[PDB]
Write a protein that binds this DNA or RNA. Structure first.
Lengths: 50, 109, 87, 102
RNA sequence: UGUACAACGGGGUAUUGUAAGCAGUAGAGUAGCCUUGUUGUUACGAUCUGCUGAGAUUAAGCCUUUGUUGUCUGAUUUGU
RNA sequence: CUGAUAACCGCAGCAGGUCUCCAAGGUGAACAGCCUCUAGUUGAUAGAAUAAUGUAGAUAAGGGAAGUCGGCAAAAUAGAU
RNA sequence: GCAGAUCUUGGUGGUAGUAGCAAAUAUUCAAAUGAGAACUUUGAAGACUGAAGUGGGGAAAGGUUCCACGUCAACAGCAGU
RNA sequence: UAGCGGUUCUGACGUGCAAAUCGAUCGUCGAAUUUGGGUAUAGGGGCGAAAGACUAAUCGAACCAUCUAGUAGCUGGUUCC
């Protein structure tokens, strides 16, 4: 936390790369039911507990 | 028709800011000069000048002067003209004493 | 003084990320994990926690090698290659 | 426009803090264009952005009062609110008495 | 469209307490000069005195006013 | 990058809690209070009237604790020589 | 087979467009953008924190909040460009 | 003073700023002082300058899961003519 170990920074990289909405072209696919990103994590709303 | 007559006044803000909270005297001095010019000129839009906003506030919220000279002009609005085509524009005129000055129509020529 | 202003002083971690099970259940001062049990030689499971044996058992992960066993049994554990027949 | 960035950069470029910068509202469209620090260094150079010099904290009543105290005024009993050892300790008067004699 | 009404100004009333500015052989003394004195002066100097019952404020729920400037037909509803 | 009356914990952008470094002028005994310079804000829903009853802040002729379970709360007192 | 078990899950009412949105001394005028500005941005004022600060750095914690471009459905207990 | 406590108003608030906060008053303020990090001690066991106090809003005996749909002479319900 401002001075870190590599394990924590690697989990931040994974939590940053997941922090996006749907790709829009999945909304069109044959047999779709995916309507939004259900596993969205903000940093105000839900702490990650590392 | 034209009605672009510009007049001077002595507004007596002592008897308009009486009994009013000290952190609300100069805001009401502004909102009372607007009502004064709406009374005289008759138009609804009043524009103050920022030099007058300095001369109201020379002395904090609570040190509004008793009498201010005013030059009020009444001018017309254009270029997407307002709800009313005429508006007032209130300026100060510099004087060492606002004591003893009758109202005066200003000659602008 | 025991409610919210005592939750004020609360900035440390008893637990950090387990290396075996990756859960943040690994107690720092104890040097042991509470979910799996690392660094024990085992992986703690208790029959009173039958839901723990639902969360952490076989089938819940990838089965990176067991997945190819029953298939590999069905052929009788063949070794070698295959011949070519037609087209 | 929205000149948050440019006020920030102009403080960080001139070196004086944000409370003393002056982004004039006549050239304001040009200031919205000047986005990088290498543009702000031009806009400070010609005169679109200036310093807004220091608020004067004139120590000229300090000097007049101390000039009076040098001639022995403002030193009756009501101008004096701490004990006589607290104003000047006895230990310092004794040190000055005795290092002089010694 | 009126000995109307308003905003200012004027007068009375009233509160306080003698303004800013200028002047003074007033001012405890201090220095500084010279014919060095029999108020010797220059400069500093809280204050005091003269103009100064002055100046300020006076209606926001004071009074009065022939003065100066303005204002005076916007909306709605109503009947046996 | 924040290090907190919005970036951490308190279900919250919660007048709570949370370790430390630098630190100007005046008054004053002083890192007190009050005022300012350097920096930093001007964010906390606002407009109008301002009756009850309130919360916070006050003052009272004469008597002075008779008030109340009890001078509870205020008052006085205070700095320096 | 249902009317009620301070029954379970869910939904919706009156109360009610009320109680409330009142600590942290405080905001005002103009211009620009814009469909629209008590709240944005700039300028002019007025103020505050007053160097045990509402200032500069950081530890713990957070995890991308940092910075720019575009943008206002939802959030910022009013508003919002 | 800072800090650390938290006495009195039986003040504010009491569907709160807050599952114990705010204001004033007050105690203590160089030591049986405050406090960070590391570490030790764990449930009939710790730890206690002792109040049966504290042990992660839980304590004359923590929290979680299982035995367990525990037992109940005692409440409450118990569905069509």
């Amino acid at each position: 936390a401002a001075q870190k170990s590599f394990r924590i920074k690697q989990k931040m990289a994974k939590a940053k790369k997941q922090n996006r909405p749907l790709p829009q072209w999945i909304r069109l696919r044959t047999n779709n039911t995916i309507r939004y990103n259900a596993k969205r994590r903000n940093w105000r709303r839900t702490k990650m507990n590392i | 028709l034209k009605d672009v007559v510009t007049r001077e006044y002595t507004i007596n803000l002592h008897k308009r800011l009486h009994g009013v909270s000290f952190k609300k005297r100069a805001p009401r001095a502004v909102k009372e000069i607007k009502k004064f010019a709406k009374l005289h000129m008759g138009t609804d839009d009043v524009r103050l000048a920022p030099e007058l906003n300095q001369a109201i506030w020379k002395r904090g919220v609570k040190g509004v002067e008793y009498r201010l000279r005013l030059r009020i002009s009444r001018k017309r609005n254009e270029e997407e003209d307002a709800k009313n085509p005429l508006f007032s524009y209130v300026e100060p005129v510099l004087v060492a004493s606002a004591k003893g000055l009758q109202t005066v129509v200003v000659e602008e020529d | 003084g025991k409610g919210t202003p005592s939750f004020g002083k609360r900035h440390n971690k008893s637990h950090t990320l387990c290396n075996r099970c990756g859960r943040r259940s690994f107690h720092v001062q104890k040097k042991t994990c509470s979910s799996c049990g690392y660094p024990a030689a085992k992986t703690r499971s208790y029959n009173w926690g039958a839901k723990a044996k639902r969360r952490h058992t076989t089938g819940t992960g990838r089965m990176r090698y067991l997945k190819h066993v029953s298939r590999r049994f069905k052929n009788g554990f063949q070794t070698g290659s295959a011949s070519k027949a037609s087209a | 426009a929205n000149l948050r960035t440019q006020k920030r950069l102009a403080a960080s470029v001139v070196g004086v803090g944000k409370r003393k910068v002056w982004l004039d509202p006549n050239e304001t469209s040009e200031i919205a264009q000047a986005n990088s620090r290498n543009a702000i260094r031009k806009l400070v150079k010609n005169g679109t952005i200036v310093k807004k010099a220091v608020t004067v904290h004139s120590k000229s009543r300090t000097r007049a009062h101390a000039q009076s105290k040098r001639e022995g005024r403002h030193s009756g009993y009501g101008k004096r609110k701490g004990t006589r050892e607290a104003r000047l300790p006895s230990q310092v008067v004794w040190i000055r008495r005795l290092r002089v004699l010694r």
